[PDB]
Amino acid sequence: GMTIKALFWDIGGVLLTNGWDREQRADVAQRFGLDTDDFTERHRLAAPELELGRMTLAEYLEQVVFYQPRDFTPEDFRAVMEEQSQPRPEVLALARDLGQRYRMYSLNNEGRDLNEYRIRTFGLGEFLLAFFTSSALGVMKPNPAMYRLGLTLAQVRPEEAVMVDDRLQNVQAARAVGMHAVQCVDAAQLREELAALGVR
Ligand code: NA
């Protein structure tokens, strides 16, 4: 087939843990003594706009946490949010290796502040050339438009690209715009499937 010219990488659940998923929020909420039902409902409402970069973290925190007096600060809270991010060593290592031979980019959903913390903390920029992130672009996976935008920014044809994501819905959406895609289950599996596409 066409030679692959670019890889697009999901970050959460692939390169790193998710930044602010259900399980993590549950944990952090407990630590801060938050009413979990109210917190979850408020997060549900506000999260998408944070993810799309149309509301600030301060704004989100105002609605989701600091809507009543608290015995801690937004800075305190933000610190603990940031700390939820941990590496996925084997996949990271694979990506770092491949980055020596291929042009690669992120295509991921994440609020700006957590995104930038994750990039700097884990040196994602050493192997990803650009970060096509929801909070920067104002669209989010699994919107077909996000995939198309990534392709447009990288200037590669759909068939010359491969999307790596842990969610089947995202893999399928990528394929629907003409991209190759592989669902990331584990490093060994991902390496083999990429190799099948000529990405070694
Ligand atoms: Na993911």
Automatic annotation (TrEMBL):
It comes from Deinococcus radiodurans (strain ATCC 13939 / DSM 20539 / JCM 16871 / CCUG 27074 / LMG 4051 / NBRC 15346 / NCIMB 9279 / VKM B-1422 / R1). Pfam families: Hydrolase. GO terms for molecular function: phosphatase activity. Keywords: Hydrolase. InterPro entries: HAD-like_sf, HAD-SF_hydro_IA, HAD_sf, PGP-like_dom2. PANTHER family: ALPHA-D-GLUCOSE 1-PHOSPHATE PHOSPHATASE, FLAVIN MONONUCLEOTIDE HYDROLASE 1, CHLOROPLATIC. The keyword Glycoprotein does not apply. NCBIfam families: HAD-SF-IA-v3. This is Hydrolase family protein.
